[PDB]
Amino acid sequence: RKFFVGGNWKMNGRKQSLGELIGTLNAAKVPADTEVVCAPPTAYIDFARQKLDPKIAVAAQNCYKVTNGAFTGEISPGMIKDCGATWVVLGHSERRHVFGESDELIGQKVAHALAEGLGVIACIGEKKVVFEQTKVIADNVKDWSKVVLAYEPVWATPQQAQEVHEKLRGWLKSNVSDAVAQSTRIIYGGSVTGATCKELASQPDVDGFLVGGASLKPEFVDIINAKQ
Amino acid sequence: SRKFFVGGNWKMNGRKQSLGELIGTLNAAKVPADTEVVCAPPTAYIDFARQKLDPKIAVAAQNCYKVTNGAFTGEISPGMIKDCGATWVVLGHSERRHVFGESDELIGQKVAHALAEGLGVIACIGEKLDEREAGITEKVVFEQTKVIADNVKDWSKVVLAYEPVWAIGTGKTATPQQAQEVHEKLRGWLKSNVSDAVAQSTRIIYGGSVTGATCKELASQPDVDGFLVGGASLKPEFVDIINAKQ
Numbered sequence: 001r002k003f004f005v006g007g008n009w010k011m012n013g014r015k016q017s018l019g020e021l022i023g024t025l026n027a028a029k030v031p032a033d034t035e036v037v038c039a040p041p042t043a044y045i046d047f048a049r050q051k052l053d054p055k056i057a058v059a060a061q062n063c064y065k066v067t068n069g070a071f072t073g074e075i076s077p078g079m080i081k082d083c084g085a086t087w088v089v090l091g092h093s094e095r096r097h098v099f100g101e102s103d104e105l106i107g108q109k110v111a112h113a114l115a116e117g118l119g120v121i122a123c124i125g126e127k128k129v130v131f132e133q134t135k136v137i138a139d140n141v142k143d144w145s146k147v148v149l150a151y152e153p154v155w156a157t158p159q160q161a162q163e164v165h166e167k168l169r170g171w172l173k174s175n176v177s178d179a180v181a182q183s184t185r186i187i188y189g190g191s192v193t194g195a196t197c198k199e200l201a202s203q204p205d206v207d208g209f210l211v212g213g214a215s216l217k218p219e220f221v222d223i224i225n226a227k228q
Numbered sequence: 229s230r231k232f233f234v235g236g237n238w239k240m241n242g243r244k245q246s247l248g249e250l251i252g253t254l255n256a257a258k259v260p261a262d263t264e265v266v267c268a269p270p271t272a273y274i275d276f277a278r279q280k281l282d283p284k285i286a287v288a289a290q291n292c293y294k295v296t297n298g299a300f301t302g303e304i305s306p307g308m309i310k311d312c313g314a315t316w317v318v319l320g321h322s323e324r325r326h327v328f329g330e331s332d333e334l335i336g337q338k339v340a341h342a343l344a345e346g347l348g349v350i351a352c353i354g355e356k357l358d359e360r361e362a363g364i365t366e367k368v369v370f371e372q373t374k375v376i377a378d379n380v381k382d383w384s385k386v387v388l389a390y391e392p393v394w395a396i397g398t399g400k401t402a403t404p405q406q407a408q409e410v411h412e413k414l415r416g417w418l419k420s421n422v423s424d425a426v427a428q429s430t431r432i433i434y435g436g437s438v439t440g441a442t443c444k445e446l447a448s449q450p451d452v453d454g455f456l457v458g459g460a461s462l463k464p465e466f467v468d469i470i471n472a473k474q
Contacts, residue, residue, distance in 0.1 A: 008301060010298070010299050010300060010301050011293060011295075011297055011298055011299070011300040011301070011302075011303045011304060011305060011308075012297045012298070013297075013308075014307065014308060014311040015311055015312075039301075041303075041304050041308055042271045042272055042302065042303075042304055043271055043272075043274050043275065043289075043304045043308045043309065043311075043312055044275070044308070044312075045272050046272060046273070046275055046276055047275055060272075061301045061302045062301065062302030064240060066240075068240055068241045068242075069239065069240050069241070070239050070240070070323060070458070070459075071239060071240040071323055071327060072237060072239050072240070072268075072290045072291065072318065072321040072323040072324060073240075073271065073290040073291030073321065073323070073324055073328070074240045074270075074271075075240060075270050075271055075272045076240055078243065079240075079242075079243060079270055079272045079273070080272065082243040082244055082272075083244075083272055089301065089302075092301040092302070094299060094300055094301040094302070095301060095302055098300060099302070099328075100329065212299070
């Protein structure tokens with residue numbers, strides 16, 4: 001499984017600060033065996049893709065479930081792809097908990113994004129429920145090649161992460177297939193810093209990170225190099 | 229002496245190619261000096277549209293959140309909107325209220341933050357079919373306007389948009405007389421609850437169905453100060469609507 005590091009900038013930054021962030025990432029050497037993705041605020045998807053070296057992919061932080069329509073304030077996978085981004089983050093804990101996005105809605109978003117040719121970082125996390133969330137996503141995924149699962153212990157150790165990730169992979173094994181369980185990256189979306197990433201990355205069922213606040217920082221480069 | 233205001237809400241439509249062409253047509257268009265024109269692109273294209281649009285046309289975001297930065301994956305702030313060169317944000321749109329369940333409380337908080345951050349706000353209100361049919365038009369639009377007003381300290385950068393949600397795909401249609409009726413009552417609310425000056429100076433734009441064929445009569449109504457145009461804003465007839473006061 002190829003190591004996967006996503007940086008979720010959340011609702012942070014402006015062109016100046018984000019430009020410097022991107023310049024730092026452009027100046028770094030990412031290991032060829034690491035897949036790196038940055039998720040800027042929606043207003044800056046286009047900006048980020050223009051400034052970021054192509055070695056780094058760009059993700060939207062959310063999308064809606066039809067290609068065009070009367071949904072003021074939303075964007076579609078087609079627009080995301082049109083801006084040069086190749087991923088979308090769906091079901092992030094903040095969309096589920098602050099904005100009340102249901103599992104059904106997230107499932108529909110997953111199916112539409114995949115149909116439109118985007119990769120999906122599909123997020124699950126608790127407050128049984130994690131398995132319910134994963135089932136809804138799985139019911140809307142026919143090809144797992146372009147999906148990555150991100151586990152969010154929104155409630156918040158490497159041992160704790162490894163424990164859940166192993167259960168998640170076991171769910172995929174019993175409910176999808178051995179092949180899907182073996183090949184699907186399951187990345188950790190809990191607290192990750194430059195100082196903690198190495199021991200988390202060493203867990204055999206932890207395949208990378210969906211990094212929060214540290215993704216805004218220089219130490220994101222260290223998280224990228226966590227297997228190095 | 230209220231300046232005629234025409235906003236074009238592109239909603240979730242368009243790609244760089246089709247929007248670039250739309251923008252080309254607008255840049256080339258004949259527009260009168262007495263009309264303030266604003267375009268609201270999908271959030272992914274705010275930057276794109278501001279770069280391509282002639283500066284005489286302003287850009288609006290279609291939504292924003294209520295703090296300047298934070299842990300709100302998928303949202304943008306007024307600071308980012310300004311940072312992309314946009315000068316307006318549309319808030320409380322019927323779609324946000326009804327499809328995405330945005331509360332009056334949340335919408336008021338957003339209005340207050342956007343204005344503080346230096347943005348103009350196109351604040352939308354309007355009653356649904358069941359509310360209209362129940363005979364509760366006044367009650368609904370006055371409550372929504374009150375929440376907005378309680379969060380506005382300087383009205384100079386606010387425009388109110390009335391959406392007859394009761395007339396969207398419901399079969400039902402609003403006459404210019406019915407539009408004027410609501411606008412007049414909304415202006416009366418401003419006069420009774422804020423001040424004579426605010427009621428006199430605040431643009432109240434019509435956000436129901438407007439076409440090139442319908443815009444002139446709607447614009448002639450004394451309390452209709454312009455439009456927030458939906459679908460037509462993606463078409464060449466938007467130029468005719470810009471010229472409705474003509």
